[PDB]
Amino acid sequence: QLVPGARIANGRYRLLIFHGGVPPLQFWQALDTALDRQVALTFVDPQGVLPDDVLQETLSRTLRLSRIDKPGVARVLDVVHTRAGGLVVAEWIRGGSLQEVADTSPSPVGAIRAMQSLAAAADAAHRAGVALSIDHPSRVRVSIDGDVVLAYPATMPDANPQDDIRGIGASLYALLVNRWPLPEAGVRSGLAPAERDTAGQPIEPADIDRDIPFQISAVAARSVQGDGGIRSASTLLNLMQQATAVAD
Numbered sequence: 363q364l365v366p367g368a369r370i371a372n373g374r375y376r377l378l379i380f381h382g383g384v385p386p387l388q389f390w391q392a393l394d395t396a397l398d399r400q401v402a403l404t405f406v407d408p409q410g411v412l413p414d415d416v417l418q419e420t421l422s423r424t425l426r427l428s429r430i431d432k433p434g435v436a437r438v439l440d441v442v443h444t445r446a447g448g449l450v451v452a453e454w455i456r457g458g459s460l461q462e463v464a465d466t467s468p469s470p471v472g473a474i475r476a477m478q479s480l481a482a483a484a485d486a487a488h489r490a491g492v493a494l495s496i497d498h499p500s501r502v503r504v505s506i507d508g509d510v511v512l513a514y515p516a517t518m519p520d521a522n523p524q525d526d527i528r529g530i531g532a533s534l535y536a537l538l539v540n541r542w543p544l545p546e547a548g549v550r551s552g553l554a555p556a557e558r559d560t561a562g563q564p565i566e567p568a569d570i571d572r573d574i575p576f577q578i579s580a581v582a583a584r585s586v587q588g589d590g591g592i593r594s595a596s597t598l599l600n601l602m603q604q605a606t607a608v609a610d
Contacts, residue, residue: 364388364408364446368391370520375403381459382500382549386411389500389514391454402436402455405516406448416519417448423517426492435512436484452527455513456507460499460533461552464540470574471609473537477603480510480533484526485595496529499542499551509511527598531585538567538574543586563587577605
């Protein structure tokens with residue numbers, strides 16, 4: 363039974379705050395009662411609803427992400443089986459979620475500037491044969507050092523890179539215009555859905571607000587599109603650097 367105040371993993375972690383998740387996953391912020399440090403717990407499968415075969419695959423792909431010493435990805439501290447199935451324990455990222463920051467109407471330059479860290483991450487992960495699983499606004503947070511970060515790691519097996527880019531776009535989008543360009547699916551993200559044009563395709567961030575520079579809007583848009591505009595975290599990074607440089 364997972365709720366604030368609950369002690370977890372032989373009571374090492376007192377649950378603090380629930381930050382959402384895509385089932386079967388749960389993103390929690392909790393306290394390391396052993397070290398009086400804070401952490402991001404990701405309960406892989408709390409309801410043990412997964413084929414215990416599968417849960418292995420997830421946990422194994424995820425552990426690969428621990429390799430990566432990027433700023434894009436919150437560092438994985440420990441992995442374990444608890445009363446509540448699989449559980450990833452990564453570092454706590456000081457700052458606020460995606461929701462939280464989207465909601466402060468940030469500079470479209472700052473936005474795409476920050477977001478670079480997370481394409482950096484996602485590219486490295488990719489070059490290393492592993493997706494970030496950018497699937498829900500909740501997964502992401504922004505650090506007081508001005509970095510976008512996969513805060514709750516757990517690469518699912520269905521997870522792929524094409525979708526990491528798509529989802530990374532949705533993250534840029536959501537900062538610029540404060541909306542989720544994707545369907546969502548799980549915890550009400552906190553982010554209100556994107557306005558679908560007469561076509562159904564979400565509406566470009568600049569068409570929605572003229573102070574959002576050309577490229578910066580363009581980047582975010584082509585990203586999400588499944589056509590799609592961009593085909594590598596690699597290039598997508600330089601796109602961000604382009605768009606960003608221009609405003610500079």
